[PDB]
Design a protein around this ligand. Structure first.
Ligand SMILES: [Zn+2]
Lengths: 49, 226, 151, 253, 48, 48
């Protein structure tokens, strides 16, 4: 439970692996990159609506 | 000299899950034509899964691939023994054209692997006839009920495992044999028309390991005899 | 504003054109939806079919329906990509006015996979496809046509 | 009871592609046989679904597998079940046959070939069409054909060969692949190897190295006869890629 | 590595700076946000 | 701050909370899942 800003810096590949993910953010999420942002699924991707 | 439409229903109940139902109407126009008897398996319509038309892409792909067999020209001898499928080369070429067009439309490795795996089944007429038994209607309608019969439930316990049931002597009702009675159970009832022409049949089999169950029911709906 | 999104080479029908056409997107060259299919936004304006056969605003004086779409109505406003189109979207074509264009298909083809191969009702596969190896419905399909002759 | 003469009872080791027979003991009752093989990736037994018993004539105590068990399945454990009823699925055993497959006239299991194929589809017994030029956008297919290795865990690592003829470890996969039926296709995301080789430094001469986890089997190193070439200045148009999982949709929900 | 479940809550802002980011979910991903979900690639954005 | 490869493996589900999440990758970002990827943005998604 970080009270201040949490900053993680990796100078090489970063790999997460989990059964289920929930990246809930009380604000704005900025997933910016320099190559293809390859969202992929075996069941499809939905939207908020 | 006879024809009609037969309703075929297959209800497979797995343990801890709801029943899965496949229902179809097979338009079959038999013809005496010696021991020759051509049934021609004219068409298969109203394919329903769990009471609803299929919607998954893979089931639709399987139906598209399997629509090439209909119409067959199965050479039933006298009671259901399919000696051969004379309309095989035409079926083979139709299925090859269908496979080519699905490959062109969707170059998917899953569909391609399915095609190669079925190629061995359809490579030879004898192999095609042997693998034709997996259909419930073909297995249960083209079968001699001589008081001692065997039926293979092709995915009875799980997907990809068969199970052999031997039925006893005892409107031609049978019953499952005595060995391993605590695991194998069920019955088979068959009711004929005036002259052969199987009118109804309900067969229930039970794998007691909860209790995997599979009930096959064939019924005559719009028959016509000349 | 619907249940899906429109991508490149999507089915498209104009109530004035003779034959249905295929959508073409060229402004958007970075955003893709289904594999390598570029998504269609409200910025896809003008000649976006390589046409709809023959235009029929005046039936006595027909001409090939070169599209001149100047407005898209039915977009999804929750994605500020311009906003993506939807199966309910309709164009203008500058010939038949609004609601002159219609989307027969969204242009997305759901190519299956191993998970979809497993999700199939394989217990009824012997009825759905008799010439079919159940191992093709597993994650790793391996061809084992082992035969045991009786001679 | 493996036959080919008449061999005694018990589990046996047989070479692939040999006409043999099975015998059973206790007129001509209804024998109902079943076939089981080990799943390559799972390692556990599974029924051979496309298992047919051709009826050339009346039933006999001996079953003839004249086609021979498949060379593609060299290294599997075929199992035959018999009986007057639904055969067993294997400890109550009196009527059961266990055969271990080995390569036909093959001294030891080995990696027979590794190539950079253009088509993702792969099957044992044929030379897959290999490619020479690929781009960072495309996804390469590495086709590994082995002899006598069925369902074998194997690591594969990608080397790069420079103008000086030195092969240096460029990349490696996080997971070990499984040779399924003496054949396997590995989809390699080629963009990673590019990024790495651009970090390390015409075209990029990417070679492959296949090492089984078993100590006895040697390793296969790719050479000039099959090495792929990454174009430093180029891109696919839309790009040979994998379709194992497929592209489903982007819907609204 | 974690054997149970991972639960990280940050009261203030979160910044991750990596080179080759890749998250793998064996079930399903649920990206929830309150303001907006930016997706900038400068090369190309794919969703499925 | 990590100068090598940051690899985190969770057997169960992963929960992340933040105020203003921001993930940047100088190479390629990849999100993988076996079920539907939910983008439940209250206001909307931005793509550039
Ligand atoms: Zn027009």
């Amino acid at each position: 439970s970080i009270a201040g800003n949490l900053s993680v810096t990796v100078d090489e590949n970063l790999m997460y692996d989990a059964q289920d993910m929930t990246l809930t953010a009380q604000g704005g999420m900025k997933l910016l990159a320099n190559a293809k942002i390859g969202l992929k699924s075996s069941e499809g991707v939905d939207i908020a609506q | 000299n006879l024809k009609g439409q037969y309703s075929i229903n297959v209800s497979t109940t797995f343990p801890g899950s709801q029943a899965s139902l496949y229902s179809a109407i097979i338009e079959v126009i038999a013809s005496y034509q010696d021991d020759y008897f051509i049934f021609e398996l004219r068409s298969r319509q109203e394919v329903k899964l769990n009471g609803n038309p299929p919607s998954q892409m893979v089931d639709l792909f399987m139906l598209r691939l399997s629509n090439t067999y209909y119409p067959m020209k199965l050479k039933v001898s006298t009671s259901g023994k399919i000696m051969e499928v004379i309309n095989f080369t035409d079926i083979k070429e139709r299925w090859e054209a269908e496979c080519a067009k699905i490959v062109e439309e969707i170059p998917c490795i899953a569909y391609e692997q399915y095609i190669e795996l079925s190629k061995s089944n359809m490579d030879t007429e004898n192999v095609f006839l042997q693998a034709l038994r997996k259909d419930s209607f073909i297995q249960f309608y083209f079968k001699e009920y001589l008081d001692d019969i065997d039926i293979v439930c092709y995915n009875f316990p799980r997907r990809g495992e068969s199970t052999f049931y031997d039925l006893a002597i005892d409107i031609k009702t049978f019953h499952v044999k005595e060995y391993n009675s605590k695991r194998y159970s069920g019955k088979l009832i068959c009711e004929y028309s005036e002259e052969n022409d199987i009118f109804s049949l309900i067969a229930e089999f039970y794998y007691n390991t909860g209790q995997c169950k599979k009930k096959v029911s064939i019924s005559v709906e719009n028959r016509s005899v000349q | 504003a619907g249940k899906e999104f429109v991508v490149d080479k999507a089915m498209c029908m104009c109530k004035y054109g003779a034959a249905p056409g295929k959508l073409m997107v060229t402004d958007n060259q970075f955003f893709r939806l289904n594999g390598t299919k570029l998504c269609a936004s409200t910025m896809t304006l003008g000649n976006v079919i390589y046409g709809f056969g023959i235009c029929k605003v005046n039936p006595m004086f027909p001409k090939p329906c070169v599209p001149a779409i100047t407005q898209w109505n039915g977009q999804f406003s929750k994605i500020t990509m311009g906003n993506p189109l939807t199966d309910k979207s309709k164009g203008t074509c500058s010939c038949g006015g609004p609601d002159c264009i219609e989307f027969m298909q969204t242009g997305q083809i759901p190519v299956p996979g191993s998970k979809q191969m497993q999700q199939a009702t394989g217990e009824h596969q012997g009825e759905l496809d008799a010439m079919g190896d159940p191992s093709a419905l597993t994650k790793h399909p391996v061809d084992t046509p082992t035969s045991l002759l009786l001679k | 009871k493996d036959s080919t003469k008449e061999v005694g009872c018990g589990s046996v080791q047989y070479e692939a592609n040999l006409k043999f027979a099975l015998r059973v003991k206790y007129k001509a009752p209804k024998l109902k046989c079943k076939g089981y093989c080990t799943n390559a990736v799972t390692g556990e037994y599974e029924e051979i679904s496309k298992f047919r018993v051709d009826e050339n004539g009346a039933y006999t105590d001996t079953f003839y597998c004249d086609d021979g068990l498949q060379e593609s399945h060299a290294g599997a454990d075929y199992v035959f079940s018999f009986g007057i009823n639904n055969p067993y699925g294997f400890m109550i055993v009196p009527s059961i046959q266990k055969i271990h497959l080995i390569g036909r006239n093959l001294k030891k299991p080995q990696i027979t070939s590794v190539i950079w194929s253009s088509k993702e589809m792969i099957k044992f017994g044929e030379d897959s069409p290999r490619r020479k030029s690929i781009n960072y956008n495309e996804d390469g297919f590495l086709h590994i054909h082995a002899r006598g290795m069925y369902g074998q865990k194997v690591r594969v690592e990608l080397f790069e060969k420079d103008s000086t003829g030195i092969k240096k470890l460029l990349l490696g996969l996080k997971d070990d692949v499984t040779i399924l039926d003496n054949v396997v296709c590995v989809p390699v995301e080629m963009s990673g190897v590019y990024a790495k080789a651009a970090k390390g430094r015409l075209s990029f001469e990417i070679l492959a190295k296949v090492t089984p986890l078993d100590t006895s089997i040697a390793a296969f190193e790719q050479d000039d006869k099959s090495l792929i070439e990454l174009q430093i200045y180029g891109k696919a148009d839309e790009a040979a890629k994998s379709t194992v999982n497929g592209t489903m949709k982007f819907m609204i929900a």
